[PDB]
Design goal:
The complex is a heterodimer of chains A (105) and B (12).
Chain A (H helix, E strand, L loop, with lengths): L15 H9 L10 H10 L4 H11 L9 H15 L22
Chain B lengths: L12
The complex binds calcium ion.
Calcium ion binds next to loops of chain A.
Family (chain A): Belongs to the TRAFAC class dynamin-like GTPase superfamily. Dynamin/Fzo/YdjA family. EHD subfamily.
Subcellular location (chain A): Recycling endosome membrane; Early endosome membrane; Cell membrane; Cell projection, Cilium membrane
Organism (chain A): Homo sapiens (Human)
Chain lengths: 105, 12
C-alpha cells in the first residue's frame, strides 16, 4: 500500500540500478535470471560456492531457484559486502528483505 | 523435511 506511514527503506534499493544494469546484461528469462546466469556472475566474483550458496539461500526472495530484480540485487550486495571485507551472518533483517514478503498481521 | 537444496552451488 503506497502512501501511509509504513515505509521501509530497502538498503539494497539505493544501489540497485547497478545490479539492474548487470541483471539485463546477463541475459534474463522473462525478466528473471536463472541460477545459470547468476552462478556464472557469482563465480566471476571469484568467491567459493559455500559463500555463494548461503548468499543464494538468503537472497532468493521468491525461493524459486531464480533471481528476480530484487533477489539478484541482494545476491550482488552480499558479494560486495564480502569484498568490503565483511561476512554474511545468514540473517535477513526486515529492511534487508524486500517488503513484498510481509504478511498482514 | 528432506533438505531444501535446489541451488547450483550445493550440487557438487
Ligand atoms: Ca528467486
Amino acid at each position: 500500500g503506497p502512501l501511509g506511514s509504513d515505509d521501509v527503506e530497502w538498503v539494497v534499493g539505493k544501489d540497485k540500478p547497478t545490479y539492474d544494469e548487470i541483471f539485463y546484461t546477463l541475459s534474463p528469462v522473462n525478466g528473471k535470471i536463472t541460477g545459470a546466469n547468476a552462478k556464472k556472475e557469482m563465480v566471476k566474483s571469484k568467491l567459493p560456492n559455500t559463500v555463494l550458496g548461503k548468499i543464494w539461500k538468503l537472497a532468493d526472495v521468491d525461493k524459486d531457484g531464480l533471481l528476480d530484480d530484487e533477489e539478484f540485487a541482494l545476491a550482488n550486495h552480499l558479494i560486495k559486502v564480502k569484498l568490503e571485507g565483511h561476512e554474511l551472518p545468514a540473517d535477513l533483517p526486515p529492511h534487508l528483505v524486500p517488503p513484498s514478503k510481509r504478511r498482514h498481521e | 523435511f528432506n533438505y531444501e537444496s535446489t541451488d547450483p552451488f550445493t550440487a557438487k
